[PDB]
Curated annotation (Swiss-Prot), chain A:
Clinical disorder: Infantile striatonigral degeneration: Neurological disorder characterized by symmetrical degeneration of the caudate nucleus, putamen, and occasionally the globus pallidus, with little involvement of the rest of the brain. The clinical features include developmental regression, choreoathetosis, dystonia, spasticity, dysphagia, failure to thrive, nystagmus, optic atrophy, and intellectual disability.
Superkingdom classification of source: Eukaryota
Subunit organization: Component of the p62 complex, a complex at least composed of NUP62, NUP54, and NUP58. Interacts with NUP88. Interacts with NUTF2. Interacts with HIKESHI. Interacts with OSBPL8. Interacts with CAPG. Interacts with SAS6 and TUBG1 at the centrosome. Interacts with MCM3AP isoform GANP. (Microbial infection) Interacts with Epstein-barr virus BGLF4; this interaction allows BGLF4 nuclear entry.
Localisation per UniProt entry: Nucleus, Nuclear pore complex; Cytoplasm, Cytoskeleton, Spindle pole; Nucleus envelope; Cytoplasm, Cytoskeleton, Microtubule organizing center, Centrosome
Name of the protein: Nuclear pore glycoprotein p62
Domain notes: Contains FG repeats.
Source organism per UniProt: Homo sapiens (Human)
Family: Belongs to the nucleoporin NSP1/NUP62 family.
UniProtKB/Swiss-Prot annotation, chain B:
Upper taxonomic lineage: Eukaryota, Metazoa, Chordata, Craniata, Vertebrata
Domain comment (free text): Contains FG repeats.
Family label: Belongs to the NUP54 family.
PTMs per UniProt: O-glycosylated.
Protein's name in the database: Nucleoporin p54
Disease linked to the protein: Dystonia 37, early-onset, with striatal lesions: A form of dystonia, a disorder defined by the presence of sustained involuntary muscle contraction, often leading to abnormal postures. DYT37 is an autosomal recessive form characterized by the onset of progressive dystonia, dysphagia, and choreoathetosis in the first months or years of life. Affected individuals show delayed motor development and may have impaired intellectual development.
Subcellular location per the Swiss-Prot or TrEMBL entry: Nucleus, Nuclear pore complex; Nucleus membrane
Effect of residue 200 to S: In DYT37; uncertain significance
Subunit annotation: Component of the p62 complex, a complex composed of NUP62, NUP54, and the isoform p58 and isoform p45 of NUP58. Interacts with NUTF2.
Origin superkingdom: Eukaryota
Native source species: Homo sapiens (Human)
Curated annotation (Swiss-Prot), chain C:
Family: Belongs to the nucleoporin interacting component (NIC) family.
Protein's name according to its UniProt entry: Nuclear pore complex protein Nup93
TM stretches of this protein: none
Top-rank taxon, per record: Eukaryota
Compartments where found: Nucleus membrane; Nucleus, Nuclear pore complex; Nucleus envelope
Role according to the record: Plays a role in the nuclear pore complex (NPC) assembly and/or maintenance. May anchor nucleoporins, but not NUP153 and TPR, to the NPC. During renal development, regulates podocyte migration and proliferation through SMAD4 signaling.
Subunit structure: Part of the nuclear pore complex (NPC). Component of the p62 complex, a complex composed of NUP62 and NUP54. Forms a complex with NUP35, NUP155, NUP205 and lamin B; the interaction with NUP35 is direct. Does not interact with TPR. Interacts with SMAD4 and IPO7; translocates SMAD4 to the nucleus through the NPC upon BMP7 stimulation resulting in activation of SMAD4 signaling.
Swiss-Prot record, chain D:
Designated name of the protein: Nucleoporin p58/p45
Function text: Component of the nuclear pore complex, a complex required for the trafficking across the nuclear membrane.
Record lineage: Eukaryota, Metazoa, Chordata, Craniata, Vertebrata
Subunit details: Component of the p62 complex, a complex at least composed of NUP62, NUP54, and NUP58. Interacts with NUTF2. Interacts with SRP1-alpha and Importin p97 proteins when they are together, but not with SRP1-alpha protein alone.
Section covered of the full-length record: 251 to 300 of 599
Ranges in coiled-coil conformation: 6-26
Post-translational modification as stated in the protein's UniProt record: O-glycosylated.
Domain comment quoted from the record: Contains FG repeats. FG repeats are interaction sites for karyopherins (importins, exportins) and form probably an affinity gradient, guiding the transport proteins unidirectionally with their cargo through the NPC. FG repeat regions are highly flexible and lack ordered secondary structure. The overall conservation of FG repeats regarding exact sequence, spacing, and repeat unit length is limited.
Further comment: In rat, the p62 complex contains two different isoforms of NUP58. Isoform p45 has however not been isolated in human so far.
Cell compartments where the protein resides: Nucleus, Nuclear pore complex; Nucleus membrane
Family recorded in the similarity comment: Belongs to the NUP58 family.
Domain of life: Eukaryota
């Protein structure tokens, strides 16, 4: 269970990020229109 | 074991298939493409050779008036002699308003017998289309494998419905996707802005 | 930023104060600040 | 099973690469635009006032 742990936190960590980025692009598209 | 399912969920998470997609789910609102794919009997090659002609060529099949313009999205290599060219056409109106011709009334035009024959002379073996009321037409009935209750809610959630419809977005490469478009988009904005700028310089001069 | 309005304005106003034969419109003298504020007040 | 972790971490990480890839890709081009249209609009006001 050393490893699985690593999976989730990496997962949630990147997820929290991906979320923010998508958003960026949304806001950029935003600005485009 | 409880252990194996967590593994499965995680594997599920990181994937394009969409079982609670890594909680990658994000919807981006795309304003409401006209894309037609053409297969040429020609090398990829016969194509990048003469790309001018080739859309002109397409241009005059269309009738070859000014309010009409042919555009090329990618050209890919399928085989040793063989090529896929994807194109869309924009149409200008009496007041100087532009939009893309829809894929289907473009496809309808090209399937014509004469036009098909003419296209065939060009080397085109085959063609395919990707696809007021029409919005209503696509937005409902759901997309790509996106869940129907979520897809609904992006519709209610939509901040700006004419300028926009809900378009399914798929994990990272999709954002990559969007960005590629954004850039695509960026260059054309910049340019048109330049065109206004040139006309203004001419008037001031 | 790239602006060209007040460059029109100044332009105008420049182009204003210099001449010409126009039977009437002679160039005007420009005041500013101390005399102008009072001039505005009057 | 430990064929196994060789692949899954591999497909997961392959994916982080794309995440990096998007990360590499980021905007100034975009920021540029509003400034310009804000600027062009102004020159148009010029020409118009002219």
């Amino acid at each position: 269970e050393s490893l699985i742990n690593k999976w989730s936190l990496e997962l949630e960590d990147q997820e929290r990020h991906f979320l923010q980025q998508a958003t960026q692009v949304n806001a950029w598209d935003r600005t485009l229109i | 074991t409880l252990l194996g399912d967590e593994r499965d969920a995680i594997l599920a998470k990181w994937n394009q298939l969409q079982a609670f997609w890594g909680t990658g789910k994000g919807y981006f609102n795309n304003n409401i493409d006209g894309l037609v794919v053409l297969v040429f009997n020609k090398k990829e090659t016969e194509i990048r050779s003469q790309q001018q002609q080739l859309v002109e060529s397409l241009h005059k099949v269309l009738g070859g008036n000014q309010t009409l313009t042919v555009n090329v999205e990618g050209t890919k290599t399928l085989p040793d002699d063989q090529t896929e060219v994807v194109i869309y056409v924009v149409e200008r109106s009496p007041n100087g308003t532009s939009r893309r011709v829809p894929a289907t009334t473009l496809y309808a035009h090209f399937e014509q017998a004469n036009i098909k024959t003419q296209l065939q002379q060009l080397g085109v073996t085959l063609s395919m289309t990707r696809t007021p009321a029409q919005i209503k037409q696509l937005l409902q009935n759901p997309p790509a494998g996106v869940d129907p209750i979520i897809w609904e809610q992006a519709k209610v959630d939509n901040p700006d419905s004419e300028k926009l419809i809900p378009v399914p977005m798929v994990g990272f490469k999709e954002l990559l996707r969007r960005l590629k478009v954004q850039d695509q988009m960026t260059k054309q904005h910049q340019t048109r802005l330049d065109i206004i700028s040139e006309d203004i310089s001419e008037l001031q001069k | 930023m790239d602006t060209e309005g007040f460059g029109e304005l100044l332009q105008q106003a420049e182009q204003l104060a210099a001449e010409t034969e126009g039977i009437s419109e002679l160039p005007h003298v420009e005041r500013n600040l101390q005399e102008i504020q009072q001039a505005g007040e009057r | 099973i430990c064929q196994d972790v060789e692949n899954l971490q591999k497909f997961v990480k392959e994916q982080k690469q794309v995440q990096e890839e998007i990360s590499r890709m980021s905007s100034k081009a975009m920021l540029k635009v509003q400034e310009d249209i804000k600027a062009l609009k102004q020159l148009l006001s010029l020409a118009a006032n002219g």
